[PDB]
């Protein structure tokens, strides 16, 4: 990570600063839209009691 | 004085600051150095290693005096000259007229060499010298005169 950080720091410096290179933890996920083209919700119910034995 | 004393403060508390379980009884350890080799050995090795047993030669009817021999280091030496007298000698450091110092008269038996005396002749009367002590002195241009 250090070798890597030194890089994208000089890669950024020689560019126009703007870095952000601390590790941040898992962020919550963003909004998003889920389609139905090809995908209508299948409805499930719970199932009666059985045995097989 | 009693008045500053912690017993004064314990008055009214049942057990005088000595426990209700463990009490203040007469002598639990045993008395004195009892059990140095048993229930008190942990405290004796650590804090007093080397305590038990023997090492060395016995010397019957030794008389300290026989071995009387205060040391003085060149470190001082120049002290034994009274101060006013001192600079009279520090300046005009030379052969032909250099201070005599009877270190025995000062009440020393050996002259050791803890380091550096000015570059100035002294005549040093002593009973004993360390090899270095004497060397250093000669480097100022003095000598050591053995006496008794």
């Amino acid at each position: 990570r250090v070798k890597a950080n030194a890089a994208k720091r000089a890669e950024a410096k020689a560019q126009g600063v703007a870095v952000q290179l601390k590790r941040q933890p898992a962020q919550p996920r963003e909004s998003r839209i889920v389609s139905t083209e090809g995908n209508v919700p299948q409805t499930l119910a719970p199932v009666p009691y059985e045995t097989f034995i | 004085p009693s008045r500053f004393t912690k017993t004064r403060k314990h008055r009214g508390h049942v057990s005088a600051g000595k426990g209700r379980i463990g009490k203040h009884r007469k002598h639990p350890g045993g008395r004195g150095m009892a059990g140095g080799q048993h229930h008190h050995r942990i405290n004796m090795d650590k804090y007093h290693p080397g305590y038990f047993g023997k090492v060395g030669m016995r010397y019957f009817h030794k008389q300290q005096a026989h071995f009387w021999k205060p040391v003085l280091n060149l470190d001082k030496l120049w002290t034994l000259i009274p101060e006013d007298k001192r600079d009279q000698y520090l300046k005009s450091a030379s052969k032909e007229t250099a201070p005599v110092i009877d270190t025995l008269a000062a009440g020393y038996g050996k002259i050791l060499g803890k380091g550096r005396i000015p570059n100035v002749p002294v005549i040093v009367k002593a009973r004993f010298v360390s090899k270095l002590a004497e060397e250093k002195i000669r480097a100022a241009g003095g000598v050591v005169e053995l006496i008794a």
């Binding site: 139905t36 209508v40 919700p41 409805t43 | -």
Partner: protein, 51 residues
């Protein structure tokens, strides 16, 4: 010496936050959202009323 709540005490409301004057002036607390028509795909309602 004695904490005054805004929320109650109108005076210190306005000590903090100057916007409170226009906020209240322009109602805002009761803003009338612009009315739109957009109605949901049959897929949406179908599967809503499915079992």
């Amino acid at each position: 010496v004695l904490k005054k709540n805004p929320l109650k005490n109108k005076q210190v409301l306005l000590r903090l936050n100057p916007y409170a004057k226009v906020f209240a002036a322009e109602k805002l607390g009761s803003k009338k959202a612009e009315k739109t028509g957009t109605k949901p795909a049959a897929v949406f309602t179908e599967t809503l009323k499915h079992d």
